[PDB]
# Entry
Amino acid sequence: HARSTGSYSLVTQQPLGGKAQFGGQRFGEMEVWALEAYGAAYTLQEMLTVKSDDVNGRTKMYKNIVDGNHQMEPGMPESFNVLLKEIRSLGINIELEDE
Amino acid sequence: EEFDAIKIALASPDMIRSWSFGEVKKPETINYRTF
Amino acid sequence: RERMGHIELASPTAHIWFLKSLPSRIGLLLDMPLRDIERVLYFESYVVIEGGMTNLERQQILTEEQYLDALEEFGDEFDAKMGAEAIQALLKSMDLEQECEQLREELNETNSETKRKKLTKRIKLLEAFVQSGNKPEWMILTVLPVLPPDLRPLVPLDGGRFATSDLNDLYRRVINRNNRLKRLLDLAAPDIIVRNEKRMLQEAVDALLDNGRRGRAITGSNKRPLKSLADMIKGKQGRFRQNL
Amino acid sequence: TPEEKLLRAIFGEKASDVKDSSLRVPNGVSGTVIDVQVFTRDGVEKD
Amino acid sequence: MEGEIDIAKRIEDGINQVQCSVAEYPEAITYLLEQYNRVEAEEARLSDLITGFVDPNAEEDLAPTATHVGSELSQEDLDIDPELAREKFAELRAQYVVTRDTIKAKGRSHATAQEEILKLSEVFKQFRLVPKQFDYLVNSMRVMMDRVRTQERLIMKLCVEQCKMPKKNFITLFTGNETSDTWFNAAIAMNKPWSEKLHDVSEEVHRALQKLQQIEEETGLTIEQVKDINRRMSIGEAKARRAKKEMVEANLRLVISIAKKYTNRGLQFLDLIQEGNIGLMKAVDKFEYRRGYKFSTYATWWIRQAITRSIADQARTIRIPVHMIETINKLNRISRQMLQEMGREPTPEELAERMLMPEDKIRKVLKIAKEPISMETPIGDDEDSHLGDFIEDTTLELPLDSATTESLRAATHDVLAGLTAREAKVLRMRFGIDMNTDHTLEEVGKQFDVTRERIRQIEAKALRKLRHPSRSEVLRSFL
# Structure
């Protein structure tokens, strides 16, 4: 079995696996700490955003390796920008801020 | 781009009134006919 | 998925993320301890003092048997009040400036066990409300935001049927909890049943925000632990550790 | 639809009313057929 | 069991104190005759105005009609021979004539006008006004004067609290006529140390006086006597209200008793006894101890009626028609009817002749009758997998076709330029650069050439030219 492209949910926005299409290997947390030990960086944030959660950063990347270019930096995760509203309905206000 | 620091503070009815546009009173959801 | 709404609640209701989260924030600053007074008044008829006639206590309760006897003679006016109705009026009628110095001088006069034991969480919390641009009367939610329909979709599955979230049920209920205590009990019912009603409102509000804390909510048909808000958010149905 | 006739007008204009929506073979490996059964509304007690 | 009949006599006793009070009320009388005119030309009926009459001409003698005059509930919870009727209604206009004029212009004293109405008041008590009317007359009586209370309350605290005026110096002036400025002007002329303070509020008092007269004229009664009518209505409704508080408290056991027939259906149990308690408070008001029927049977009638109305529509999470749920059990009490006799399943052929449904459309009806199903329900993984987490989205294009749809709506206007200027510029320079297409008499002056004929030809000729853009596409995407 091998998967490269497939369908995605709405609120969840994650790689699935239908019938005709295969399924993607879920990068378990057990393989996250083993990577942090090396002291990496970009190869850790990718297995959290574009390669799963991030949606608008997944489509833009697909149009970068087709012409022989390079994909830019991912954006803000979808499971994070919705949490801001999820917590907002709990009588508590949350607001982002730069420097 | 990227994220820096995060600010957290209590929520006031004056602020929640801003985002909101009105109030819901009818428990009824949608219709099965014209959807 | 953005923007929200609200619901004008005729009866004030303290939040749950600031009540069970010791130290208290809706009672501690109001002289109320933590549980030996701010939990029993929510249940059956337990009239508590919120104002005061001429130099009285702010923790002593009042038995219904001694209520009808303290109306005519032997008693004064006595600002009587039910449960949730007596918690928001205090926040607005208190001065953090003066009250702060009242408990600051009570750290050596009396022993550190009868009062100081609790007063240790008085100067700390209040100091935060002063340093920051906040205010005590923000813990009481007169309205309640609504979760975006995108997190609670309603799209037909297959066969002309549909598909809705059980969370929606927690909205069609709260409506019948408020409109009932407007033109039926608050001007007709004696008192031995109007109290019970007010007890159901507070229990029906703190259940939506976070279910599992106190009085777990159960849907109509097919029981099963009814889902709420906070439960689905952080995922408390798995004791956290086994997160997603 | 009008806008549809534009596409097929490039690759041979021949849009029929009915098409061939037969059950295609799933991914993997195919195989021969054993038996074939047809029950065009039999007079028996079928549900 | 009893202990509810002896106190039931206190109910109708209070109503009698309301019947008389409402009688002396011009607004309540005018509406009576004015409504009678809708009967002559045939628009309404005397059914919603009068139900019966009485023989004695004193203070009632039989179970009155006024039921919603001392009810504990809110206004929102309070919802014979025609030949003989028209005969009595003709007796009112045989005296209301003089009253119809003493209201329009009247004079200085309103005691003269009400004096004539007093005679009619005795006749109004004879009529059995529909209980629905009392929900308007009495209601619009406490509200109409409600403004009068506040309108005169402001000027009361703008001189006593503001200008500092003794209570003995305001109850001897304003209590007089409280109509014209004969009480205000008399205060200043009293050469008091406080009389020279009303000049800083005379403007506010004047406005609160002129508008005050408007209500007095609208009613047609004296501001002093109008209070007498209502003050005695709060006495009769109080003696009956508290008397009914003992029947709606000791009978809470009967509410839960019949509350086992409408349990798990669509509404919770906490909101179940809601319509049960409100029903008991309604029956106790319209109850008659002088009737053969008891209370433990007559009261449980309205109770099961209020609980069968709420769960009759707003049961499911989504709205549901009435007959859609009554059509299911309809075909049920017949399915076993043919099974207990013949022993075979009723085929959709014999029931198609007894029902109004064919056989095909009746099958699609069952598809509607469902729950249907939630979303946050475990499937297989029972960890992160949810029912609403396997449905693909169509409004949000996936990365696969994200690059395709982009190259199919931004490349045609490049090769479009390489085409006959005339026909190409017509369509392009119309909606592509401007707004709105097809103007006819306006497009003919846009190119300055032909008439309104090629408005359709040029477009058609251009359409077949849109077949050129193969690798490039723009139009083939809207549909």
Observations:
- Chain A has five helices and one strand.
- The radius of gyration of chain A is 16 Å.
- Strands of chain A lie at 92-96.
